[PDB]
Amino acid sequence: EELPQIEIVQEGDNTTFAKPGDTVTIHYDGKLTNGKEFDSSRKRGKPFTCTVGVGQVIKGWDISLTNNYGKGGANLPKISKGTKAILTIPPNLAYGPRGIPPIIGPNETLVFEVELLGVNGQ
């Protein structure tokens, strides 16, 4: 299957990993491949909290934060608490062929800078 690109820029505690159903808290920056930013929790003023692995965020996010639903994968490093990463997510794992104009265009790849701040409120 097709997976997102995950590059660790800062290692976490290598102990606290999130799994489907868990609640996570992260800070993130979202930009198009042309460098143009489309979303950012840091600029909004608060970290984002959500349930991962159940499709309540884009599929690329669920995969990165739960290590492919616990299945893992080829070249798919784990993200623990305190980990900074860069997520590259293809259209099929983002907003697909139609996209969400005028917020995001069709057939669009997305690049995220994410920092895992907490798992299950801790």
Residue numbers in the entry: 3 to 124
From the manuscript:
The 12-kDa FK506-binding protein (FKBP12) is a ubiquitously expressed peptidyl-prolyl isomerase with considerable homology between fungal pathogens and is thus a prime candidate for future targeting efforts to generate a panfungal strategy. PPIase proteins all catalyze the cis/trans isomerization of peptide bonds N terminal to proline residues in polypeptide chains. In addition to its role as a PPIase, FKBP12 is a member of the immunophilin family and is the target of the immunosuppressive drugs FK506 and rapamycin. Three extended loops, which have been called the 40s loop (between β2 and β3), the 50s loop (between β3′ and α1), and the 80s loop (between β4 and β5), surround a deep active-site pocket that binds both FK506 and rapamycin.
Three different crystal forms of the apo C. albicans FKBP12, to resolutions of 1.99, 2.3, and 2.4 Å, were obtained. While the C. albicans apo FKBP12 structure is very similar to previously determined FKBP12 structures, an unexpected finding that emerged from analysis of the crystal packing was that despite being obtained under very different crystallization conditions with distinct crystal lattices, all three C. albicans apo FKBP12 structures displayed the same intermolecular interactions between subunits. What is notable about this interaction is that the 80s loop of one subunit docks into the active site of the adjacent subunit and vice versa, suggesting that the loop may act as a substrate. Indeed, Pro104, which is located at the tip of the loop, is inserted most deeply into the pocket and is surrounded by residues that have been implicated, via mutagenesis, to be involved in FKBP PPIase activity. Three residues, in particular, were implicated as important for FKBP12 catalysis and correspond to Val59, Asp41, and Tyr97 in the C. albicans protein. These residues all make direct contacts with Pro104, which rests within an aromatic cleft formed by Tyr30, Phe50, and Trp63. Although most of the contacts that hold the loop in position in the active site are with the central Pro104, additional hydrophobic contacts with Ile102, Pro103, and Ile105 are provided, while Arg100 makes hydrogen bonds with the carbonyl oxygens at the edge of the pocket. Notably, the interface in the C. albicans FKBP12-FKBP12 interaction is minimal (burying 592 Å2 from solvent), which suggests that, like known substrate-enzyme complexes, the proteins form a weak interaction; typical dimer interfaces bury >2,000 Å2 of surface from solvent. Comparison of the C. albicans FKBP12 apo structure with FKBP12-FK506 structures reveals that the 80s loop binds in the same pocket as FK506. Interestingly, unlike the C. albicans apo FKBP12 structures, which were all captured with Pro104 in the cis conformation, in the A. fumigatus structure, Pro90 in one subunit was bound in the cis conformation and Pro90 in the other was bound in the trans state, thus potentially providing a snapshot of self-catalysis.
